[PDB]
Structures are given as C-alpha cells and as structure tokens.
C-alpha cells in the first residue's frame, strides 16, 4: 500500500484514484492529521505564516523588477497623460507579423502588454523616479523574502520549537501589536514621507547618499521644542504648484486644508503626513492597556466577566467566553477573515471616491480595475469567514462553558433569526423586481411618462448635510449659518466644499431613481446571502430532521435517499450554495459602478439616468452597445490589440459552459460508463498488456461539486474582466 496521502494511512492503502484526489484535498487540514498535538499544530501554523510572508514579498519584488527592467517609467514620469505604462515583454514563437506589429504598437520597440495596475502612479507618487531605484527596491525586498524563509526553518528546528505558553499568551502580543507594529509603523511611514517624498514633490531629489544633509523644514524642530506647533503649518503649496517641482511650492510640512491638489487632483502629501502621524501617536498610546508582567494593566477575564448586564437580560453576559476564544482557533480565524473583508470593502469605497494617487482618476482603466478587484477579494473573504465560523460550531464548540451566556441565547432564538431574515429578503426581492419590470413594460409600450421614479430623498438629505448644496436643503454644512460651519470655516471646509462642488471628480456624484433602485437590489443581495450563510452556520450542530448531524463533522455528501431524500444537507453544502449568491451580488454592484462611471467620463450622464431605470436600457445600451469593439478585436480582415481580449472572452465562456456539465450530471451514470470502458480496455487484444496502478472510478459527490464550482467561477470572472478592460481601454 503505496505512501500516497502520507498523513492519512487509510487512504495510503486505498488502491483507487480517490487516494490521489483526497490526499491532495486534505493536505493542510492539520486538525485531521496523524498524531496531531497542540504544540505541533501551533508550530505548524507558525511555519505557515512564514511561508505566506515570503510569498507576498517575492510577489511585490517581482513586479518591482519586471517594471524596473522592461517598463517605460523614466519616460512616463515626464508626461503622466499620453504615456501608457508597459507591463512586460511579450514573447511567443506563434505570433505572426500582424500580431507582433499590433502588439508592438503601444509601448516601445517590441510587443508589450499595457499594465493597468496603478503601480506606476503609486511609485512615482511616493518619489520613485529612476530605474536604478526600482532595482534597489526589488533586490532589497528579495533579501527580506529569503530572511523570512530562513526564519521559517530556524523556528521549525527542535531547539526553537516554541513553547505553548509564549504561544497562547495574549496581552503581551496585543500590547506589542497595538503599540509597535501599528503606531511605530505609521510613524516611520510619515518619516519616509516627510524626509524623502515631499522634497521630491518640490522637484528636490534627496537620496540615501545625501539625505543626511537637508532640513525638511526651515527650522529644525525648534518650534516643536518650544511648543509652537503651528509654525510647521505655514506657507503651504500654492494652487499653482506644478507637481514634482519647486514652482508653486510651499514650506508647511503638516497641513490640513482638504480638497485635492488642483493639478494632480490628488490630495495633499502634507495632509497624508499629518494623518499617518496622528494615527501613529494614537496607536502607540493605545498599546498601553493590558497587564503584562508589571502588575499594572488589565485583566481580560475580569473585564469580560464584569461585562454582564443585570436583570439577567443576557443571563451570564460574557461568561465562559475568555477561554472558548483563547482556545478555539476556528473562532479567531473567522474573526480575522470577516475583519479584513470589511477592510477591503472600505478600501475600494474610499479609493474610487478620493483617489489619493498622483494623476489618479485619469486612467479610468486603472480606476475600474482596482475597484472591482478589491471588491471581489472582499466578497470571497467574507464568505470564507462565515464558513469557518460554522466549522467552529461543528467542532470546537462546548455547551457547558458557553452555557447560559449570549452564545447559548443565540441558538435559543435561531428560529426567529432565520425567519425574519427570510422575510426581509423575500419582500425586497418581490417589490424591487416588480418595480423594475413595471418600468420595463411602460418603456416597451412607449409610455415613459407612466413609469415610476422614486427619489433618493434620504441620500440627498445626507449629501446636503455634507455640504453639497445643489439640492437646496442647506443645513449644517451647506448652511453658512451653521455653528460648525462658522467654527471649522478656516481649516479644511474651503477645499472640502470646493472639491464637493466640482462635478468632475469622483467626489459625491449626484443621485437619482436609478441609484435608488440599484441600492435596493444591493441590499437584497446582501440580506439573502447572509441568510443562507448564517442558516448553514447555525444548523450545523443539530437539525430537527437530523438531530445528530454534529456526529458527522463538517462535510459529508448526503444521507441516503430515504426519509424522503437527503440531497446536500451539510453546512459545507450550505456554503457551497451561498457562493452563488455572493457572486451574484458582487457582479451587480460592479456592473452598476462601471456603467455610471462610463457615462460620467463620456458626458451623457442623462443617458445613464434615463436608460438606467429599465432593464432593456441597461442591456442594450450598456452591454450590446459596448460589445461592438471586442467582438471586432479580430475579424476575417485582420486583428488589433484587442484580439486577445476577444479570445479570452470566448475562452471564459467555454470554461463556464463546460463546468455546467460537472454541476448537473451526477456520479452513478459516469460510473456505469467507466465500467463498460474498463471492460473494453482489458478485453480488447494487445491492450491488456499494460496495467495501471490506481483503479478508475468516478468522482465522489463533493469532489465533483467542488470541481464544477471551480470551472463555473473561473469562466465567469474571466469573461467579465476581459469585457470590462476591452471596453474601457479601446474606448478611452
């Protein structure tokens, strides 16, 4: 019995190919491993984190180098408009002269892809100018990569396999991460900012060789050391400062004015300095809360247990939590995932709204790509967070400790929870769809005067409260009579109101019934996806149908056709069904963003506000209208720079349509097939000579379901990305 799946000796004895399959499948499920002990597990996750760090460092340094080698940077910095960035040298023995020529036109002497990854804007904005420096940065990042790998090995070793005490300590790490890894981080961030970048924005090159010879401000630290902190905020950059030059320069270093730099349309480096500085101080002072070995500090368990309301309204309040979290790792995993998911969301939301990169909000390709990519990342992250919370329930949960407190009370009212979620999702669906189709029928009868168009009154309210006075509520930020108006009049409100009054920046666009309706569709998608996920998470312990489901673990295919059939009852399968709704929602939000921004950049935003309230308008005017170029990327005539994108379009369509077969057909059929087939293979003459090792069978139910989902999602994301990029670039 071959050593296939090592960690799993039973499979290692399996003479079928499912050996190979599942041995691959459960590689990293260290809980489900042989002789798994706790300190073992911990040192394993420790090496894993090392691996992840090394990978990410290699990724970044690799992009750094590929640019530093084959990019158009040092020309690009000159004209930040008519210079498109070079991705990486194209090489292929298949490409004919037409493609070479067509691919050659776009960068320099040789076919090249045009990177749409914003790294150009970023790096130049931070102060990157010359290829020499990019080489330096890349090689240094690779240095750190190898260092992390070596740390992985060294800490694997016996004399450094760490103690479970230093592992499970919490206050120490929390203090160290809220003081050092965060505060000092932003502090050194500001350090580079002020001592390097803003000089370069003054056209002032300051390298490592001479940076020990330049005061970043007229008077070194004297006003601070007197307590005169206002002095460093004097003489800011003019509204005429040609970016990266000494023209229109100023001498303040820590400003607060609001509004974008008028030429860059990118916010003030001085403001960025003061921001990261302020939050650095806040973090460092925050990291002094809890009790390490100094008597002073906090007692986490004390705080928790004290945090329990009278009147038994929560009963045990926060009883038994401290350990159920300080022990169960699935819980922390779920927490961290949900957190970073929300953070990726907010990242995209603020990136498009207030582009902080120099000459960002001009490369619409860059903007759209960045935004939608971070969106999809966040969606995936949250879905996984929920899956892992469910697994925490199925395995690490205990009733005795968590008994009586909020955790128990959850499972107590799970029924009402799920029921109300179902109801809200159902009503949203009903009314939103009905309204849309009424709009469509009024359109198709050519009676647009009849269709309904709700006004986003609340949103206009909030924006007028924000100071965009257009609609004329004029209270508390666009009411000049406002006390806050008068108070903060002199500091950032000027640039703030200016930029919010511009209608060409991405700042607080106007709004209407289209925005209203798509908002409600978004809310519905959110609610129903969360519903599916949480039902799957909570019913993982015990169901009325299968009261002992907890005895089977997280994943299992089915439970026999009896009892009236049990298809896909695992919480695993609940997640497997939630993923579809997640994709649906993210697709909707990205479509809407893309259409409105296209209409903005072109000019007929009226066309958006009209064709955006009925689905036929959406479809015909947005997809079928924007498809015309891609499907012409080549033709029986020739080709162009978009032939590849048309090809990828079609390729994704095929991936999708093939993964469908996975999703729909099930096993026993293919099993009968493969049986007849193997009879043929051995009974035909001269073929029975060779004989395989691992026996052939169809895929297990869950295996097939997963491979199908993979095919589906891959095809999906490919087609959409190709379409989007083709449209934006071939049109702008």
């Amino acid at each position: 019995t071959k050593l296939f799946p090592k960690f799993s000796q039973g499979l290692a004895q399996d003479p079928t190919t499912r050996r190979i399959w599942y041995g691959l499948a459960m590689a990293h499920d260290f809980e489900s491993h042989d002789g798994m002990t706790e300190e073992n597990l911990y040192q394993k996750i420790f090496a894993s984190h090392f691996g992840q760090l090394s990978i990410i460092f290699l990724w970044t340094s690799g992009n750094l180098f590929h640019v530093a080698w084959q990019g158009n940077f040092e020309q690009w910095v000159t004209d930040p408009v008519h210079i498109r960035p070079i991705a990486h040298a194209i090489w292929d023995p298949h490409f004919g002269q037409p493609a070479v020529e067509a691919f050659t036109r776009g960068g320099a002497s040789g076919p090249v892809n045009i990177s749409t990854s914003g790294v150009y804007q970023w790096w130049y904005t931070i102060g990157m100018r010359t290829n020499q420096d990019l080489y330096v940065g890349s090689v240094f990042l690779a240095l750190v990569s190898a260092i992390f790998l070596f740390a992985g090995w060294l800490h694997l070793q016996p004399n450094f396999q760490p103690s479970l005490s230093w592992f499970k300590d919490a206050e120490s790490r929390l203090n160290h991460h809220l003081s050092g890894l965060f505060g000092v981080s932003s502090l050194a961030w500001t350090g580079h900012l002020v001592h390097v970048a803003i000089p370069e924005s003054r056209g002032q090159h300051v390298g490592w060789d001479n940076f020990l010879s330049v005061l970043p401000h007229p008077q070194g630290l004297t006003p601070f050391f007197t307590g005169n902190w206002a002095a460093y905020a004097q003489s800011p950059d003019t509204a005429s400062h040609v970016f990266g030059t000494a023209q229109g320069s100023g001498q303040a270093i820590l400003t607060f004015l609001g509004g974008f730099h008028p030429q860059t349309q990118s916010l003030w480096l001085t403001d960025m300095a003061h921001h990261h500085l302020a939050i650095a101080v806040i973090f460092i002072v925050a990291g002094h809360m809890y009790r390490t070995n100094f008597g002073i500090g906090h007692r986490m368990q004390a705080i928790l247990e004290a945090h329990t309301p009278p009147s038994g309204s929560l009963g045990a309040g926060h009883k038994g939590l401290f350990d159920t979290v300080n022990n169960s790792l699935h819980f922390q995993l779920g927490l961290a995932l949900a957190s970073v998911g929300t953070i990726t969301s907010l990242v995209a939301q603020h990136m498009y709204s207030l582009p902080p990169y120099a000459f960002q909000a001009i490369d619409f390709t860059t903007q759209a790509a960045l935004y939608t990519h971070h969106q999809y990342i966040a969606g995936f992250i949250m879905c996984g967070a929920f899956a892992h919370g469910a697994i925490f329930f199925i395995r690490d949960y205990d009733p005795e400790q968590n008994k009586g407190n909020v955790l128990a009370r959850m499972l107590d009212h799970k029924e009402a929870l799920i029921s109300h979620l179902s109801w809200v999702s159902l009503f949203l669906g009903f009314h939103t769809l009905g309204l849309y189709v009424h709009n469509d029928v009024m359109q198709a009868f050519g009676t647009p005067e009849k269709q309904i168009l709700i006004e986003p009154v609340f949103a206009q309210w909030i924006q007028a409260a924000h100071g965009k006075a257009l609609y004329g509520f004029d209270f508390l930020l666009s009411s000049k009579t406002s006390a806050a108006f008068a108070n903060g009049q002199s500091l950032w409100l000027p640039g703030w109101l200016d930029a919010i009054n511009n209608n060409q920046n991405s700042l607080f666009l106007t709004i209407g019934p289209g925005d209203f309706l798509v908002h409600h569709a978004i809310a519905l998608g959110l609610h129903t996806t969360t519903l599916i996920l949480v039902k799957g998470a909570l019913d993982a312990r015990g169901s009325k149908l299968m009261p002992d489901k907890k005895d089977f673990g997280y994943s299992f295919p089915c439970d026999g056709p009896g009892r009236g059939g049990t298809c896909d009852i695992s919480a695993y399968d609940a997640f497997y069904l939630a993923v579809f709704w997640m994709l649906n929602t993210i697709g909707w939000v990205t479509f809407y963003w893309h259409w409105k921004h296209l209409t903005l950049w072109q000019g007929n935003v009226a066309q958006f506000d009209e064709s955006s309230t009925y689905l036929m308008g959406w479809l015909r005017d947005y997809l079928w209208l924007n498809s015309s170029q891609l499907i012409n990327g080549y033709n029986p005539f020739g080709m162009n720079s978009l032939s590849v994108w048309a090809w990828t379009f079609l390729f994704g369509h095929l991936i999708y349509a093939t993964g469908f077969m996975f999703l729909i057909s099930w096993r026993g059929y293919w099993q009968e097939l493969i049986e007849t087939l193997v009879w043929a293979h051995e009974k035909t003459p001269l073929a029975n000579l060779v004989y395989w090792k691992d026996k052939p069978v169809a895929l297990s139910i869950v295996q097939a379901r997963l491979v199908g989902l993979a095919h589906f999602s891959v095809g999906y994301i490919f087609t959409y990305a190709a379409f989007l990029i083709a449209s934006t670039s071939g049109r702008f």
Partner: protein, 165 residues
C-alpha cells in the same frame, strides 16, 4: 422646488417630449382614412394621451430635467408640501387590505383546525364557513389589537423544537 425639481406643469422637457409624441402620432395617423376604425382608434388614443398629460400636470407632479415624474417618501415632507397623494395613502390602503386577507386566512385555519378532518377541510372548502368568515373579517384591526391586549394571539413555549433549542 424641492431638492431641485419643478412642477411637471412647467418643465420644458415635458412639453418637448409631448410635441415629439404628437409629431409621431400625427405622422403615423396621416396614413389612414378619417372614418376608418383604425383612424377613430388613433384619435381616441391621442385623446387619452392628452387627458393623461392634463391629469399629471394638474396633480402638481415633480419632474426634473428628465421630464418624467418623480415621487417623494417622507411623511413630513409630503405633508408639508401637499404630496400625500402619492405614497402615504397608498401604503396605508395596502396595509389595511393585506391585514384583512391575512386575518381572514388565520381565522379560517383556526376554525377548521378544530374539526374531525383537518386534511379534508383543507383540501375542500366549506362555503358557508368561508362566507361567514369573509364578512366578519372586516373589523380585523380592532379584533387583532383586542387579542393582543388579552395576550392571546401569541403562543406560549410549546412548539416543536430542534434538539439544542
């Protein structure tokens, strides 16, 4: 006007869209006779269109640059500016009729539940019972609030329940 709108009775897009609808209507109608049933149909059509535009303008409807009307949903706003005839009255009417339907349904279910063949009464309906319960479904809001004040509509903790809780 409100939030940056103007009464449909005044919007120019309103009028120009109307002229365009009528340029279409005339330059389509001029192909038929005057006495043809097609002709009289087209005439009634244009007439109804004019009547519709008249009613919408007289209602004081708001319509921005689109010319297409719009609706506002805040009780205070709609009332302070005479816009209750668009959302408020409709939502209250629907709530009433829906509560009616639900209540008569609940009463039928309960009444037929205490009989010798619930499955049979559920697959086949008692006409007299249906009619009685229908006509008595009227005062359903009062009946329901009274049941609440007696604390009868909600059941105690005796429901079928999964093993954990």
């Amino acid at each position: 006007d409100i939030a940056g709108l103007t009464p449909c009775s005044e919007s120019k897009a309103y009028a120009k869209l109307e002229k365009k609808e009528l340029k279409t209507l005339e330059k389509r109608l001029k192909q038929y006779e005057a006495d043809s049933a097609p002709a009289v149909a087209l005439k009634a059509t244009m007439e109804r269109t004019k009547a519709r535009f008249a009613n919408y303008a007289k209602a004081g409807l708001l319509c921005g640059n689109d010319g297409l009307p719009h609706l506002i949903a805040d009780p205070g706003l709609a009332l302070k500016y005479g816009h209750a005839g668009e959302v408020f009255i409709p939502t209250f009417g629907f709530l009433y009729v829906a509560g009616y339907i639900g209540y008569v349904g609940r009463q039928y279910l309960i009444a037929v539940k205490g009989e010798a063949k619930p499955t049979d009464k559920e697959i086949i309906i008692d006409v007299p019972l249906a009619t009685k319960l229908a006509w008595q479904g009227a005062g359903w809001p009062l009946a329901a609030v009274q049941e609440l004040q007696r604390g009868t509509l909600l059941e105690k903790e005796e429901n079928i329940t999964v093993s954990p809780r």
